[PDB]
Amino acid sequence: TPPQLDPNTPSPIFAGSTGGLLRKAQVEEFYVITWNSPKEQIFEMPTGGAAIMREGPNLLKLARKEQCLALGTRLRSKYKITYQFYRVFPNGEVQYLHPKDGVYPEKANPGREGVGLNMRSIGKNVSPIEVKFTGKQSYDL
Amino acid sequence: NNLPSIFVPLVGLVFPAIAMASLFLHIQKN
Amino acid sequence: MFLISWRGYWQELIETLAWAHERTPLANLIRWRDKPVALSIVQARLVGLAHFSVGYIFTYAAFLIASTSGKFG
Amino acid sequence: SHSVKIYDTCIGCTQCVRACPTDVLEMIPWDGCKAKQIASAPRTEDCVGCKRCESACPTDFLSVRVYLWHETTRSMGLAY
Amino acid sequence: SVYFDLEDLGNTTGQWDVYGSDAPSPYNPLQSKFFETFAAPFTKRGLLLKFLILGGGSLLTYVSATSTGEVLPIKRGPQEPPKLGPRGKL
Amino acid sequence: EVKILVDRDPIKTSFEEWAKPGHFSRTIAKGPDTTTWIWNLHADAHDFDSHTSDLEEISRKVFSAHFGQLSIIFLWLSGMYFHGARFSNYEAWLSDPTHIGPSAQVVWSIVGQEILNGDVGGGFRGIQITSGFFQIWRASGITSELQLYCTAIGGLVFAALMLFAGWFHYHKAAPKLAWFQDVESMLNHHLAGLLGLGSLSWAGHQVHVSLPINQFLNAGVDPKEIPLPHEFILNRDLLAQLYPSFAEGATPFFTLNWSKYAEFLTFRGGLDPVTGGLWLTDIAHHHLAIAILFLIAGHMYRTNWGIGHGIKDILEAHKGPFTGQGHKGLYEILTTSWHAQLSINLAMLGSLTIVVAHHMYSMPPYPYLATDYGTQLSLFTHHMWIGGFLIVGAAAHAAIFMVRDYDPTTRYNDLLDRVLRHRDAIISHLNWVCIFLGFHSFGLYIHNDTMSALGRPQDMFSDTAIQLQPVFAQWIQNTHALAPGTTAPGATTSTSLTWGGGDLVAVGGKVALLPIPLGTADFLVHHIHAFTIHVTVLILLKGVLFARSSRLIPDKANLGFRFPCDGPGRGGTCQVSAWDHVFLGLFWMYNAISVVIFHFSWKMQSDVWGSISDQGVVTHITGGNFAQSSITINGWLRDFLWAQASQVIQSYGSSLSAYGLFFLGAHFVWAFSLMFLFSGRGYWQELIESIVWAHNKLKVAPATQPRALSIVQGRAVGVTHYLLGGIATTWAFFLARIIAVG
Amino acid sequence: MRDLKTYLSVAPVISTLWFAALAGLLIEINRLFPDALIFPFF
Amino acid sequence: DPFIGSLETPVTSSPLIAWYLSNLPGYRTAVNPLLRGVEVGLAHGFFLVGPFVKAGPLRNTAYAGSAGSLAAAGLVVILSMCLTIYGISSFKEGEPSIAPSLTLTGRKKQPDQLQTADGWAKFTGGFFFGGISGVTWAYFLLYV
Ligand code: CLA
Ligand code: CLA
Ligand code: CLA
Ligand code: CLA
Ligand code: CLA
Ligand SMILES: CC1=C(/C=C/C(C)=C/C=C/C(C)=C/C=C/C=C(C)/C=C/C=C(C)/C=C/C2=C(C)CCCC2(C)C)C(C)(C)CCC1
Ligand SMILES: CC1=C(/C=C/C(C)=C/C=C/C(C)=C/C=C/C=C(C)/C=C/C=C(C)/C=C/C2=C(C)CCCC2(C)C)C(C)(C)CCC1
Ligand SMILES: CC1=C(C/C=C(\C)CCC[C@H](C)CCC[C@H](C)CCCC(C)C)C(=O)c2ccccc2C1=O
């Protein structure tokens, strides 16, 4: 799938709180989650309190990926809404984060490369004495 | 004599401050 | 204190304290270089054990020496 | 970043992928099981160490293993 | 009703000074010149640190050594006659 | 409208559900696979909100449980009355209350425990009781044992009636949901009917029965010569001889010339010199006034008729400067869930219990109660502990509600959202206040200890070197002492003798009450109390507010209310649930209550209690060493713990020996608790594996495979053992000291 | 009757009955023979 | 911005509070740090002189105040040390200022030079000089 863009999406109606962004967002990174709602309704923010999502496209800024994924999974489970989130850097780079292939990870998709596979039982790992004085680890072999 | 009156303040106060400053500077150095 | 109370409570408290330090005026000019976090599990267990042992040894040494030297008999 | 490894005893029940809170694991086609799929952990750098994937795994011993390793801002769960 | 702009990130991430002021200095030029000329030697950092450490140590040692017994009860020493031990020990 | 709605035979009574354990939950009802099943069967027994989702069944179960609890309480009261009637020396104590110790229990003679039958007095041997029941019976006018037997029989009958009522209201006619959701009628009936009418009837009893009998007793008449209580009702001549106002009958009451009843309805205040207690006429007057007030206040809410107030209208139509629209959807929240009501009632009951303990120790309402020190100490400590436990439970139920019954979509409240939107500032400010208070309060004591240990008694914070006096409390005391002179012309004297100013009251050669001085030590102990209370409040509030979610864990509400952790990741997430916060706040409640009771005991023994000779000098139990020895930790350890523990450790071979045994046993239990607080589950599971192998070798393997306790179960066991051991130690020490020395 | 008998056979009820009987027998034995430190029948 | 971890309250955002805080020497961006540090040190030393002479170990003798004054001066020295190291571990020799660049309105403004090696060095020197001067002035005014 080709990554999308989020040029000028508006934001939900919130009154403000103390659970928002901090110095890390200005210094290190933050995250942006965008979705589409068919009607105006009230949802619960991960940072505390309740907000109202405008009908149409909605955009939100958060601090960590866990909050974004929790909000997205709540939206999918309760409202049946498609969502996607990116990560934003101080220099202006925007990196597409949620589904990279265009399909959800729980669904098998052809053309996916396998990482971290060991073709043996968990009890076939070598003893730590065999890998001593080397930079490798037993489970890495 | 009167060596303790000169040596106890030195070990108790000045040397810990010098050591703390040196260790803090060495730790914070990149 | 280190032997019953565990990490999550103190981590949330540290987060709240960090927010409080960041938001206040005349003290946000000073900023830390290492992010403050709560102690680990094994580290807290070790600290509690060290405190327990030090208290044990000091208390018994004081009691024994004082009791044996008060009478000298 | 912690280390997540997958072994060949997996039966492709997709519980670990659903349990992950940071979208670390996904599913790929495979050949040596009835379900014809197997899990993988590409986005290793986003792991926090909650070990929910190990909590949800039916096997004699877990086919997904998490080993704690060098910590960073992401793995420490810091938002400040 | 927008809060995210990619062109600049200072407003998006909230990089402001709440109470900063850019007004000109209110201090009198003559007093400023006097303080600038008289406080110059302490501007250097390493020299200031070395001077502070050495001066503090020397002053503390000199005050401790030169102090008399009136201020410090430890320097006055005992006055009452000594006492015997429990079992008659000296 | 208001109506009676019931359902006929919702459930059928049978023993088929008794045979199969755990029928309420399907997972439990499936069967035992391991031993953990058993530990679950008792944990989820009373969680009615998890068995089903309909409110009707939960309400019916709650009603039946209330009826069963009432039956149990009635059985306990009947047992107490029967013990007072049969095995007691009440009749001997009645004639000479000062020189006889109450006793209502007799021990058998099987093993050698007959040494526990001490010489209480009055030709009796038994265990001295500290429940204060004898004073209650004397104040009620009871002068025989047949009346106590009749009261016990009535209690048994009422307990049976309560049990039958519970069965009837669960299995025969169960009220519908709309019956429980009618709060206006319930409030009207609880205010006007339960409280006003009961107090009015008690005032009538006091006017007709208690006052004449107590007057005859105070005159000096033998208890066997006093006329029976119904003789006063039957014979108006006797009452006319006692109180002439009764000769006029009830005519003055309707004539509005109520002054004629001034003989037995007075406003003097103070303590009665003969018995060292409050006047009974004042008590009857207070009960009458309270009855009038409650009867008037019970007609405020609109039920079934035009006149009245609506609670929802009152809440919604509220406008204020700081509040605003505010309380709009609180009515639905309060009338929807049981947990919010439970938390509110628990907190209110705890506060009321603490206030009750304070008011009871300050102004003794029963005759011959101030001069019995053990009863006073036991009542104070017991009520303080009960109040603390209730206050702790309130926060746990509030957290339970916030976790499992809060949704901002269907039922939204503005105030709760506003509070939840700025929790960080609240937590930070509370943390700073706790740190500051603790630093100052404990640094004062540490500075005093260090200055005294270095031979510098002139640098301490004491009444002689550096004085920190409670000026505001002294001003309040002076105002209260001067109150009846000008501010309250109706009262002859002040309400209590505690206020600085007045005279000393002593009964039978023992001090009853005298003004209590205030100094630096009171200042320090009060600040310590404030510090401990603030820390407990901080812990409970942090537990309640961060229950749904947190910066570390953004989805804590999905895991539930009782979960051990989230995992070894994020650096460690042990003890993140609100249950862990309650389990942690229990310790601080225990600490605070222990400090409070220690302060009360030492101050009362040092500055108030004592004895008086014929000349007029007063000798206190500890000789007034509180003001100079309680300013350092060493003084607290030596002059209180070491000095006052002589009686408990030397009680072997006497009638108090049992107490001494408890003083050891509790200690053991305390240490036992540590085993459950310092270790983990994996070690025990790995040991049980080898034990199970050793069992398997000999063909004695059980089908239910043994399993180590869960983490939450281990924490609960540890905290329970800790609290039980500490409380039992304090109980044994206090009772032994106050019985051997007082 | 079947369900009542099944309930009466549950573990806590049987345990309390057994322990009450044992305690009563021990108490009665200690009452009939007050003190005992050694076995004197032989 | 409702999504920033800060709230707007009458105390935190009022014209009086804003003016009073912006007129404090620690927030004057245009002024060079030495003149601000001098005032800060003067005020801090003048305040610090008191408690040492009022609650010192020798507070009852004739030497008391003098001794207390000396103690106050010593504290200033320690504080100066606590400043110097804080510079060395924070600001490098060639890096620019790290202060915020734009104001609350959005206008671009020159960043403060206090968050720089030379700026912090000037601030510490001025603080030391002002603290010593304030301690001396307080002692002279109190016991002459
Ligand atoms: C390890 C050795 C050590 C030593 C030798 C001292 C020595 C002293 N202590 Mg300190 N102290 C220590 C550790 C030590 N302390 C620790 C661990 C603690 C924490 C509990 C304290 C907490 C403490 C308190 C709470 C107090 C002292 C005070 C004192 C002074 C008591 C003498 C006197 O009666 O006043 C004589 C009169 C004086 C005021 C002396 C004035 C001159 C001093 C020495 C300053 C010289 C200035 C110089 C620039 C110092 C900075 C240089 C830097 C390198 C240290 C003396 C300077 C007392 C004090 O200083 O009063 C405020 C006092 O109140 N100490
Ligand atoms: C925790 C509280 C505590 C407190 C309040 C005190 C207090 C005191 N101690 Mg003790 N002490 C303590 C604990 C404490 N101690 C502990 C734990 C130990 C170790 C065992 C000692 C050991 C000790 C020693 C060894 C000595 C003392 C002595 C003294 C006195 C010396 C005071 C001084 O010189 O410095 C005061 C210095 C200051 C800079 C004051 C700072 C506080 C200011 C006023 C802040 C107020 C804030 C303000 C409201 C801000 C608002 C801002 C707004 C305007 C915008 C003082 C009465 C000394 C003595 O001899 O006294 C008779 C002494 O020699 N103490
Ligand atoms: C004026 C009559 C009246 C009275 C006296 C009471 C009294 C009481 N109610 Mg309330 N209640 C009333 C009206 C009344 N209610 C109405 C109209 C409603 C419906 C809106 C309720 C709804 C209600 C609920 C849902 C519950 C109570 C409970 C209670 C008990 C509280 C326990 C306690 O505090 O110990 C005080 C102890 C005593 C005084 C015991 C004395 C026994 C009393 C006098 C029984 C007679 C009361 C009854 C209303 C009259 C019988 C009618 C029937 C024969 C036809 C107490 C018995 C709670 C309870 O404990 O449940 C059992 C409870 O859960 N009430
Ligand atoms: C006013 C009455 C009251 C009521 C009706 C409830 C009701 C409820 N509570 Mg709350 N609670 C209260 C007060 C109350 N609570 C107080 C005062 C506290 C503070 C301690 C708590 C703290 C609390 C916690 C921490 C929890 C609840 C939970 C629950 C629910 C489960 C009940 C359960 O299963 O226990 C059935 C009974 C037991 C498990 C017995 C345990 C054994 C006890 C602890 C031993 C006491 C021993 C005895 C005093 C000493 C003698 C020893 C001798 C036996 C040898 C239930 C809805 C539980 C829940 O899951 O909610 C959803 C839960 O986790 N409550
Ligand atoms: C007696 C030992 C003990 C002590 C001292 C503490 C101390 C503290 N507890 Mg812990 N705790 C303990 C046991 C103990 N706990 C146990 C058994 C448990 C059960 C698991 C807990 C569980 C617990 C909880 C759940 C909480 C705390 C919190 C706190 C803090 C309260 C704030 C405050 O008062 O700080 C002021 C400081 C003190 C009272 C400590 C003593 C300091 C004295 C005055 C010495 C200072 C001298 C000087 C500065 C030393 C310098 C010398 C050096 C230079 C050589 C404080 C750090 C609360 C918290 O952190 O919130 C703020 C909190 O929420 N504790
Ligand atoms: C102790 C006890 C008991 C007992 C109890 C009793 C004995 C009770 C009683 C009670 C009673 C005995 C009550 C009564 C009441 C009454 C009332 C409540 C009344 C009322 C009245 C009225 C209201 C009136 C009115 C009027 C008027 C105002 C005028 C004219 C007309 C008329 C008359 C109508 C028992 C065993 C159970 C249990 C245990 C404990
Ligand atoms: C605190 C407590 C307690 C106590 C309690 C008590 C003591 C109670 C009481 C109560 C009471 C004391 C009650 C009462 C009630 C009453 C009533 C309920 C009444 C009624 C009445 C009526 C109904 C009447 C009627 C009539 C008549 C008859 C005549 C005229 C007409 C009329 C109709 C009016 C105890 C220890 C348990 C413990 C826990 C807690
Ligand atoms: C001691 C301990 C154990 C072991 C404790 C166990 C196994 C409890 C054992 C309870 C009883 C004694 C077992 C037997 C119960 C049956 C009713 C026995 C029936 C036979 C006769 C006695 C009637 C844990 O499992 C544990 C888990 C987590 C943290 C701390 C700890 C911990 O400290």
Say yes or no for a CB contact (<8 Å) between A10 and E1. Answer: yes
Q: Exposure of F93 by Cβ count < 10 A (0-12 exposed, 13-18 middle, 19+ buried)?
A: buried
Closest atom of ligand 7 relative to the F199 alpha carbon: 12
Q: How far out from the chain centre does Cα H34 lie? A: 11
- Taking alpha carbons only, the member of F495, F500, F488, F514 closest to residue F278 is F495
Which residues of chain F make contact with C41, given a CB cutoff of 8 A? Answer: 568, 572, 574
Phi, psi angle pair for F620, to nearest 5°: -85, 165
In the stretch 1-30 of chain B, residues with CB closer than 8 A to chain H read 17, 21, 24-25, 28-29
Q: How far is CA F180 from CA A50, F175, F177, in A?
A: 31, 8, 6
Judge whether F19 and F688 are in contact, CB under 8 Å.
no
Which residue among F447, F460, F468, F633 has the greatest number of ligand 2 atoms within 8 angstroms of its CB, and so is best to mutate? F447
Tokens of A22: 């901090």
Q: Give the H or E element holding residue D40.
A: strand D37-40
Dist CA F476 CA F478 (whole Å)? 5
The angle that helices E45-66 and B15-28 make with each other, rounded to 10 degrees, is 160
Tokens 């170990």 belong to which residue? H57
List CB contacts of D1: < 8 A, sequence separation 6 or more.
Answer: D44, D45, D47, D69, D70, D72, D74, D75
**Cα dihedral F141/F143/F144/F150 (nearest 10):** 0
Q: Which residue of A has its CA nearest to H100?
A: A26
Asked if E4 is an interface residue toward chain A (Cβ–Cβ < 8 A), one would say yes
- Mutation to test the A interface, candidates D7, D34, D65, D76, most A Cβ within 10 Å: D7
Distance CA F558, CA F560 (A): 5
CA distance C26 to H17: 13
D57 is in an annotated binding site: yes
- Max CA distance (Å), chain A: 62
Contact call for residues F282 and F266 (beta carbons, < 8 A):
yes
* Residue from B7, B13, B20 whose CB has the most chain E CBs within 10 Å, to mutate: B13
Buried b (16+ CB within 10 A) or exposed e, E22-59: eeeeebeeeebeebbeebeebbebeebbeebbeebbee
H or E stretch at D4: strand D3-7
The pair of structure tokens assigned to H26 is: 């620690």
H109's CB contacts (< 8 A; 6+ apart) are E17, E20, E22, H29, H101, H102, H103
- Give Cα separations from F399 to A48, F434, F534, F557 (angstroms): 15, 22, 19, 11
**For H112, which residue in chain C has the nearest alpha carbon?**
C29
Instruction: Flag whether C touches F (3+ CB pairs, 8 A cutoff).
Output: yes
Give the integer Cα–Cα distance in Å for H138 and G35: 87
Experimental method: cryo-EM
Angle in degrees, CA F470, F476, F482, rounded to 5: 135
How many Å apart are CA C46 and CA F596, to the nearest integer?
34
Structure tokens at F212: 């004449």
Nearest Cα of chain F lies from the Cα of C49 at a distance, in angstroms, of 10
Q: Residue F600: which of F529, F494, F495 has the closest Cα?
A: F529
**3-state secondary structure (DSSP) of residue C56:** helix
B2, B14, B21 ranked by CB distance to E57: nearest: B14
**In this structure, what token pair is assigned to residue F740?**
């051997």
Strand partners, D40: D26
Q: Which two tokens stand for residue A51?
A: 């907000």
Long-range residue pairs from F562-567, CB within 8 A, at least 24 positions apart, any chain: F562/F712, F564/F710, F564/F711, F564/F712, F565/C8, F565/F711, F566/D50, F567/D49, F567/D50, F567/D51, F567/D52
Query: Are the beta carbons of F522 and F600 closer than 8 angstroms?
Result: no
What are the beta bridge partners of residue F173?
F8
Do F561 and F544 meet the contact criterion of CB atoms below 8 Å apart? no
DSSP F301: B
Residues F669, F661: Cα–Cα separation, whole Å: 13
Torsion of CA F620, F622, F625, F626, to 10 degrees: -90
H57 lines ligand 1 (CB under 6 A): yes
Distance CA F254, CA C9 (A): 66
Quote the CA–CA distance of F657 and F663 in Å, as a whole number: 10
Tokens of A28: 């290190």
E45 near H89, Cβ under 8 Å? no
- Residues D50 and F567: beta-carbon distance below 8 Å: yes
Q: For H116, which DSSP code?
A: S
**Interface contact B10-E75, CB threshold 8 A:** no
Could you count the other beta carbons within 10 Å of the beta carbon of residue F477?
19
The structure tokens listed for F315 are: 């809440």
CB contact under 8 A, E9 and A21: no
* Closest D-chain CA to A114: D40
Looking at all shown ligands, the one closest to residue F62's CA atom is 3
Chains that touch A (3 or more CB pairs under 8 A): C, D, E, F, H
d(CA F582, CA F391): 11
Could you tell me which of F448, F343, F446, F445 has the C-alpha nearest to residue F398?
Answer: F343
Q: Measuring CA to CA, how many Å separate B28 from each of A24, H82, H88, H97?
A: 20, 14, 9, 19
What whole-number distance in Å separates Cα of residue F501 and Cα of residue F480?
9
Residues in a beta bridge with F618? F612
The residue written with tokens 């105030």 in the block is F415
Ligand 4 atom nearest to F346, measured from its CA: 1
The structure tokens 């060596």 sit at: B3
Q: Is H57 on the interface with F (CB under 8 A)?
A: yes
| Cβ atoms of residues F494 and F481 within 8 Å | yes
Distance CA F578, CA F319 (A): 34
H helix or E strand, kind and range, residue H33: helix H33-55
Residues D47 and A116: beta-carbon distance below 8 Å: no
Helix (H) or strand (E) holding F292, with range, is: helix F280-297
Separation between Cα atoms, residue A11 and residue C11, nearest integer Å: 31
Chains E and H share 3 or more Cβ pairs within 8 Å: yes
Separation of alpha carbons F240 and F264, rounded Å: 12
Identify the CA nearest to F241 among candidates F231, F250, F254. Answer: F231
Instruction: Tell me the helices (H) and strands (E) count for chain F, helix number first.
Output: 32, 8
Here the tokens at position F527 are 């600040």
C13 contacts on F by Cβ (under 8 Å): 427, 431, 542
Which residue has 């609109």 as its token pair? Answer: F302
What atom in ligand 6 is closest to the CA of residue F198? 18
CA distances from F428 to C6, C22, F431, F541 (A): 20, 12, 5, 12
Q: Which residues of F touch A48 (CB under 8 A)?
A: 420-421, 423, 548-549
Smallest Cβ distance to E4: which of A26, A32, A90?
Answer: A32
Q: Does C70 touch chain E (CB under 8 A)?
A: yes
Distances in whole angstroms, Cα of residue F612 to Cα of each of F507, F601, F741: 10, 20, 16
- Rounded to an integer, what is the distance from CA C34 to the centroid of its chain? 19
Which residue(s) pair with H4 in the sheet? A21
Contact yes or no for E53 and B17 at CB 8 A: yes
Torsion sign (Cα): E47, E51, E54, E56: negative
What gap in Å lies between CA A11 and CA A34, rounded to an integer?
A: 9
| Cβ-contact D12, D35 below 8 angstroms | yes
Contact A94, A88 (CB under 8 A): yes
Q: Which residues pair with F6 in a beta bridge?
A: F175
Give the bridge partners for E21, in sequence order. H28
* Contacts with E42 (C-beta within 8 Å, 6 or more apart), sequence order: E48, H124, H125, H126, H128, H129
Do the bridges between strand F6-8 and strand F173-175 make them parallel or antiparallel, or are there none, so unpaired? antiparallel
- Kindly determine whether residue A11 and residue E2, on different chains, have CB atoms separated by under 8 Å: yes
Could you tell me the two tokens for F77? 């009261």
Cα atoms in the 13 Å half-sphere on the side-chain side of F567: 24
Radius of gyration of chain B (CA): 13
In this structure, chain C runs to a length of 73
Burial of F143 (0-12, 13-18, 19+ CB in 10 A): buried
Q: Do F139 and F210 form a contact (C-beta atoms < 8 A)? A: yes
SS3 category, A34: strand
Q: Considering only residues 15 to 74 of chain D, which have any Cβ-Cβ distance to chain F shorter than 8 Å?
A: 21, 47-52, 68, 71
The helix/strand/coil state of F178 is helix
F460-469, long-range: CB within 8 Å, 24+ apart, which pairs?
Answer: F460/F631, F461/F520, F461/F524, F461/F631, F462/F520, F462/F628, F462/F631, F463/F519, F463/F520, F463/F627, F463/F628, F467/F520, F468/F520, F468/F523, F468/F524, F469/F518, F469/F519, F469/F520, F469/F523
Number of Cβ pairs < 8 A linking chain F and chain H: 4
Type of residue at F4: I
Show the CA angle centred on residue F500, arms to residues F498 and F506, nearest 5°.
50
What are the CA-CA distances from residue D42 to residues A69, A101, D72, F502, G11 (Å)? 17, 13, 18, 84, 54
Residue A37: phi and psi, rounded to 5, are: -115, 140
Rounded to a whole number of angstroms, the distance from the CA of D54 to the nearest CA of chain A is: 13
User: CB contact, 8 Å: A132 with chain C?
Assistant: no
Identify how many contiguous H helices and E strands chain H contains and give both numbers: 4, 0
Q: Is C9 annotated as a binding residue?
A: yes
DSSP string, F563-618: ---S-S-TT---S-SHHHHHHHHHHHHHHHHHHHHHHHHHHHHHHT-EEE-SSS-E
Task: Establish whether residue F77 lines the binding site of ligand 6, counting it when its CB lies within 6 angstroms of any ligand atom.
Answer: yes
Q: Within a 13 Å sphere around the CA of F741, how many CA atoms are in the beta-carbon half? A: 20
Check if the beta carbon of residue A65 is closer than 8 Å to that of residue A71. no
Q: Whose CA is nearest to atom 64 of ligand 3?
A: F63
H21: which 2 tokens? 């805080």
CA dist A66 and A49 (Å) reads 18
Chain E contact for C8 (CB, 8 A cutoff): no
Calculate the alpha carbon distances from A17 to A48, A51, F419, F421 in Å: 8, 11, 10, 5
Q: Which residue puts its alpha carbon closest to atom 41 of ligand 2?
A: H51
Spacing, Cα C7 to ligand 4 middle (Å): 26
Give the ligand whose atoms come closest to the C-alpha of residue F678: 8
Cα dihedral F125, F127, F130, F134, rounded to 10, equals: -40
Question: Which candidate, D72, D22, D12, places its Cα nearest to that of D52?
Answer: D22
Is the torsion defined by CA of F214, F215, F217, F221 positive or negative?
negative
Cα gap D5→D63, rounded to integer Å: 8
Residues with CB under 6 A from ligand 4: F 42-43, 45-47, 389-390, 392-393, 396-397, 400, 562, 579, 582, 720
Mutate to test the pocket of ligand 1, among H78, H80, H132, H135 (most ligand atoms within 8 A of CB): H78
Task: Using DSSP bridges, classify how beta strands D3-7 and A117-118 pair: parallel, antiparallel or unpaired.
Answer: parallel
Which positions in chain C touch E87 (Cβ < 8 Å)?
Answer: 72-73
State whether residue A9 sits within 8 Å of chain E by CB.
Answer: yes
Q: For residue F679, what are the CA distances in angstroms to F671, F705, F711, F718?
A: 14, 22, 10, 11
Residue type for position H71? A
**C-alpha distance across the termini of chain C, in Å:** 39
Contact of F561 with F403, CB cutoff 8 Å: yes
Contact C16 F431 (CB under 8 A): yes
In short, whether F445's Cβ falls inside 6 Å of ligand 3 is no
Give F570's contacts in chain C (Cβ within 8 Å): 11
Return the half-sphere exposure (C-beta side, CA atoms, 13 A cut-off) of residue D8.
Answer: 9
CA distance F340 to G34: 59
Structure tokens at F566: 């989230």
C-alpha angle with apex F641: F640 to F642, nearest 5 degrees?
A: 100
CB-based contact H81:E52 (threshold 8 Å): yes
Residue nearest to atom 57 of ligand 4 (CA): F47
Alpha helices in F87-145 (DSSP H): 90-95, 133-140
- What DSSP element (H or E) covers D49? none
F440 lines ligand 2 (CB under 6 A): yes
**Can you read off the two tokens belonging to residue A37?**
């709602």
Residue ranges in chain A assigned as alpha helix (H)? 23-27, 65-74
Displacement of CA F610 from its chain's centroid (Å): 28
Contact F422 A67 (CB under 8 A): no
Contact F561, F399 (CB under 8 A): yes
Tally of residues, chain D: 80
F67 within 8 A of F165, measured Cβ to Cβ = yes
* CB crowding F682-714: b at 16 or more within 10 Å, else e: eeeeeeeeeeeeeeeeeeeeeeeeebbbbbbbb
State the Cα–Cα distance between residues F684 and F678, nearest whole angstrom: 13
Would you say the C-alpha torsion C34, C38, C41, C46 has a positive or negative sign?
positive
Count of all residues that appear for chain H in the document? 144
